[PDB]
Design a protein around this nucleic acid. Structure first.
Lengths: 95, 68, 49, 211, 147
RNA sequence: GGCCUAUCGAUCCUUUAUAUUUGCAAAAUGACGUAAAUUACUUACUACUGUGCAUAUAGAGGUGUCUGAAAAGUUACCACA
RNA sequence: GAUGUUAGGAGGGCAAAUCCGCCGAAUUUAAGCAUAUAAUUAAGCGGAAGAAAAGAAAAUAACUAUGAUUCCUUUAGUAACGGCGAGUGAACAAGGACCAGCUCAAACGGUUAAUCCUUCGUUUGGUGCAAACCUUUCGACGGAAUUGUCGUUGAAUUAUUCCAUGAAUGCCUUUAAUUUGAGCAAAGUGAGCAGGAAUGCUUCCCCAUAGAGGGUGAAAGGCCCAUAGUUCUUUUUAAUUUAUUCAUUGGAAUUUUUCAUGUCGAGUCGUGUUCUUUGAGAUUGGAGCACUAAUACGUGUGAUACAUUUCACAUAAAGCUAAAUAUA
């Protein structure tokens, strides 16, 4: 059960914000290195496919890309993070 | 461990002791820590920690006292 | 075979043990019981000595 | 298996004779532990060998009203006392980094406890007859006379023990201060019923705050 | 111990006190709990009614601390005071005892029995029954929910 | 239910029904709904509140060696109780 | 990269109770048996120590929160697994024992690698009869080391306060323990009787802080060794006693005030898939294979698959470390 870090807890034993009544208490180098690495190394092969899907720029193509990324890395979380990161690169490069 | 540079240095020194012969044959390398399940602590690795055999032996161990 | 793990001892109970001590001391108090226990106590002046 | 008697359930089925151990050692082992620790205390220049510990409140629902010795005073508690961790460590006050003072009362209570121990202790000059003010907020050294007289005194160890909670349940209130209109049961069940919706709102506030 | 045992009473008697005709053979039904559902089914039906199969919801780790909560009935409540104190309250109407149910290690107050009529009492506890609240109120006392 | 005397099936499991009954373990998913309120981590108040899985209750899927092991032969080469 | 009877060194084997890796059964149980069970056992093979292993949070909780590891007491025959049969089976808290923390790597330091090592030497000691050990600073000449050793543990700066420091003269006393070997060690060899010979039987004497044990021609406190008791000497380690002057280099902790807000282990984690293993259940751990990440507002836990998201708690993929604890 959630607590509140302001409006201190009710003295009762159950329900929301409950319990005993004591007074509760209370990036530059990274970019440079990454940029150097990108100039040396370029994209992954899968990343190249992902770039082409993002470049197509449609709901079907983007949906396919998200699913593809999920298959390649395993799990939604990793795939989504990668798709957003590549998409951001594609927008920036296109600009 | 039979050459002075490791014997002198107070850093890293420990590996010269007689008790660290053959770490790789005993599961006392990073790989060793891995396959014994010693890398991951917490409830998830449960029984591994004092050694897998040791843990089994403690759990089996049946104990009596003089007066019961 | 006889093993190492016979039930050798017994957990005798605190309250009972205390009572046994009190009662044993009290029994010693009584003249007839000491004599009965077989001591040659015939010429002693008093049993709580 | 036969008639009324409960179902059998004895887990000696995997080999167990090769696995008994019978402790005939109890009293002798106890005597040994005592003798070593006593010997150590005797060795250590008449100093106590016990280390100070914070009082803490027990984990979870089960023991919420009870209090016991923890492990390690935290940085806030040391700072409040007027000590720094290494210095504290030398005079037997035990440290940690892990604890964090969640609520006010516990911090105040622990700094008072540290202070009481600190005020009590009297310090031997390190290299003899060379007494100085010293570092880290450790209490300053002392002369020969005070030390000599103090060594002769009994070292009272009461501070090391756990604090007794003084019972105060047998307590009295005037009848005409009682408020009889309250419904405790109703309040409780309603609070339980309303919990999900309150969480739903709280979650929304938390989202709002973070942006 | 040994001298009292049953076998010494029967000591020379061929069966050892264990039946000439059928004799005592090893493991005579099969081991332990085996005969359930089949040849010892009648014993299992007749002595352990509900035994076989599974029923109800699963619970992955109980973590028993969460759900701990000893009970007391109101009936015993005045008994948590010593005698002399109780008499003093009976004599003097103007004051009443508070009772903190936590200090004696109980969490929920239940409703068995009869309280002394017209002694108010203030009850501090984590949990109450519906009945208990009504009874405590009926005698003019108050319930205080407290952690 | 069939004029009466016959016409048949445990546990696990599955399956589909039922409910203003419940769970999924620190939390949330109807709905910022209804009032207010100020510009916000605001206050009340609401039987009905994601997917999937699970329970509880009720049938049904079958055990004809029918109170319910998933099971073919052979030994004149043979062993043992 | 070879090569060297080059110079200095090391490993091999034996021993296993406890201890650590593997590899790995079945008899058995189920009244049969095939999943289970026996059992992460036995056998097989490798490796250590006086104990080992584990260890300094990718922990638990959901509280008024705890807080490295091990062990005991316990939770618990419980949650749970299982022809949901036979049977198997944890964790958290709580009470204790003990109680100890740490360093690489990463960052930072170039008007100068401040490191490290062999060989040659060289001196302040102390013990010891001698043998010998044990302390002790100071240089060479080689090498090694920037494909990264060393220092530092954000950075300066204020006040306060400490610690190493070096020289002179002085001073090593009394006790307490502790542990070895050492000594010394109380009174009857009194009648009489029967006996081969009392230590027996009487009876008259006694000693005991010793009437434990043993020996002696039959049961001996006084026959003997020993025993009780002490007196020394041995081990180490407490307490106590005395330092005082002068000397300079170097380091540390708070505290002010600034300014910097930095770093954090990849074919690894993860996921799929397999097989194994488990209390682990739409996978507990391991393992093979395939795919293969993110940078701290990250990513990992929060025991039912998932999405969209809170919040608590942690900081993986490098290392070490006493204690308790175990011993057929």
């Amino acid at each position: 059960g959630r607590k509140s870090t302001i409006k201190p807890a009710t003295g009762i034993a159950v329900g929301f914000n409950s319990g005993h009544v004591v007074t509760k208490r209370n990036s530059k180098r990274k970019e440079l290195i990454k940029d150097v690495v990108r100039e040396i190394t370029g994209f992954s092969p899968y990343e190249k496919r992902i770039i082409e899907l993002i470049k197509i720029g449609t709901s079907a193509s983007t949906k396919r890309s998200l699913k593809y990324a999920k298959k390649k890395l395993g799990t939604h979380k990793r795939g989504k993070a990668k798709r957003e990161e590549i998409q951001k690169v594609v927008i920036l490069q296109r600009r | 461990p039979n050459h002075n540079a490791v014997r002198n240095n107070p850093k890293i020194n420990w590996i010269c002791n007689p008790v660290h012969k053959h770490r790789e044959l005993r599961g006392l390398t990073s790989a060793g820590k891995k396959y014994r399940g010693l890398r991951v602590k917490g409830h998830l690795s449960a029984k591994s920690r004092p050694s897998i055999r040791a843990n089994w032996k403690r759990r089996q161990l049946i104990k009596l006292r003089k007066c019961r | 075979p006889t093993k190492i793990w016979r039930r050798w001892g017994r957990k005798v109970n605190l309250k009972e043990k205390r009572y046994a001590v009190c009662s044993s001391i009290a029994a010693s108090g009584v003249t007839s019981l000491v004599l009965a226990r077989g001591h040659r106590i015939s010429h002693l002046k008093e049993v709580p000595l | 298996v036969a008639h009324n008697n409960v179902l059998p359930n004895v887990h000696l089925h995997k080999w167990w004779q090769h696995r008994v151990r019978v402790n005939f050692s109890k009293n002798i082992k106890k005597k040994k532990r005592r003798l070593l620790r006593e010997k150590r205390r005797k060795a250590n220049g008449g100093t106590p060998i016990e280390k100070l510990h914070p009082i803490v409140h027990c984990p979870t629902q089960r023991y919420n009203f009870r209090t016991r010795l923890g492990k390690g005073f935290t940085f806030e508690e040391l700072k409040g006392a007027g000590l720094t961790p290494r210095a504290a460590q030398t005079i037997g006050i035990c440290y940690d980094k892990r604890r964090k003072n969640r609520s006010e009362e516990s911090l105040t209570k622990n700094v008072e406890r540290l202070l009481k121990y600190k005020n009590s202790l009297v310090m031997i000059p390190l290299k003899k007859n060379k007494a100085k003010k010293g570092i880290g907020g450790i209490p300053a050294d002392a002369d020969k006379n005070t030390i000599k007289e103090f060594r002769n005194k009994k070292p009272l160890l009461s501070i090391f023990k756990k604090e007794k909670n003084t019972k105060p349940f047998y307590e009295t209130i005037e009848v005409s201060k009682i408020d009889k209109e309250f419904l405790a049961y109703k309040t409780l069940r309603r609070a339980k019923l309303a919990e999900r919706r309150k969480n739903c709102r709280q979650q929304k506030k938390d989202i709002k705050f973070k942006s | 111990a040994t001298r009292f045992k049953k076998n010494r009473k029967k000591r020379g008697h061929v069966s050892a006190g264990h039946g000439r005709v059928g004799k005592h053979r090893k493991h005579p039904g099969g081991r332990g709990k085996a005969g359930g559902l089949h040849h010892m089914r009648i014993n299992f039906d007749k002595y352990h009614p509900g035994y076989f199969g599974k029923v109800g919801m699963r619970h992955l780790n109980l973590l028993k601390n969460r759900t701990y909560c000893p009970t007391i009935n109101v009936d015993k409540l005045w008994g948590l005071l010593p005698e002399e104190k109780k008499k003093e309250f009976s004599e003097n109407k103007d004051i009443a005892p508070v009772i903190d149910v936590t200090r004696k290690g109980y969490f929920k107050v239940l409703g068995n029995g009869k309280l002394k009529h017209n002694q108010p009492i203030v009850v501090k506890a984590r949990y109450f029954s519906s009945v208990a609240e009504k009874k405590i109120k009926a005698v003019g006392g108050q319930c205080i929910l407290v952690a």
